[PDB]
Amino acid sequence: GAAAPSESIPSVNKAWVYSEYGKTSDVLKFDPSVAVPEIKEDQVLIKVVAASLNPVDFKRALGYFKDTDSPLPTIPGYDVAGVVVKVGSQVTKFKVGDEVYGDLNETALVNPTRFGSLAEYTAADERVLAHKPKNLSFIEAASLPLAIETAHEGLERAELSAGKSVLVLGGAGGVGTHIIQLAKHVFGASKVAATASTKKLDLLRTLGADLAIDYTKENFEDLPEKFDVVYDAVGETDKAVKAVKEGGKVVTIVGPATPPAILFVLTSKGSVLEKLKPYLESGKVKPVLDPTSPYPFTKVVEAFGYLESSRATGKVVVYPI
């Protein structure tokens, strides 16, 4: 990985951009000529191959986090997979030509980049990236970082460990599909229970749930079974706290959190992906893609509209970019 010829990297590129807050159907526009970000010394420039959408992208675009956002206009997209084309002078872990993936924003709600992953090129901090597993496609890799890292961090915050039981509220989404798989296959849970609607129960079982609960037909909090860990990925902490054993832990990623549940927001770290690499290489933990994925780069507004419906099964990914 010697440097690319500097004139081989463009200074403008195609991207999706919004200039004011609002609904993606209203504000998200394609721009054929936006600046390619200049890298800082601890960043790399990536030729984007694929990107995933996350709810944070649309919530951010609605202005929910305006007080700590970066300045508009914004090119959205946190999740990226692609190929390194330039490395900053303090970078040690990556070279030109490395295939990488990660969630661009170390702190999702505080100064996320102006120059996201829904663009042909993006700048990424070395610290948020990992080497792409050779057995995963770029679509598959792009689908992973924000969700899998949120799953991982919530389970560590809940102190999940071998032999314990866990209940996942929202098992079929981008995050929940990884909560299940990590809980069973990485954290050694004895029993994994998860909620979803009627047609999604078989998927939950396939991913590692021992008990799949149809929330449209029964109320988990009214079951006699109580769990060592409850991980809420929906926003139902009032009920979650009724399903935990005394001394157990309840975490949520959708606030506000009713004590004793806690709310956290993930920290994006390439080291987490690196820790998970063997499970990803062996197939013990798999990417989960929505059947409508991938969406071409022309169809980003439609991809957002689908994610905004709250019905995605696993991940919504944009490819080719």
Ligand SMILES: NC(=O)C1=CN([C@@H]2O[C@H](COP(=O)(O)OP(=O)(O)OC[C@H]3O[C@@H](n4cnc5c(N)ncnc54)[C@H](OP(=O)(O)O)[C@@H]3O)[C@@H](O)[C@H]2O)C=CC1
């Ligand atoms: N705090 C943080 O760090 C983070 C927070 N988040 C937040 O967490 C939430 C989940 O994100 P993500 O997984 O990407 O979202 P998705 O849009 O991928 O979740 C969609 C899934 O939610 C399921 N679902 C919806 N309502 C319910 C319910 N009441 N019970 C069970 N399942 C339900 C749907 O299954 P069905 O069709 O069966 O209802 C669908 O499969 C979002 O609000 C997001 O903003 C996400 C990541 C990090």
Ligand SMILES: CC[C@H]1OC(C)=C(O)C1=O
């Ligand atoms: C309430 C958490 C906020 O942060 C992330 C990453 C989301 O998806 C949110 O809504």
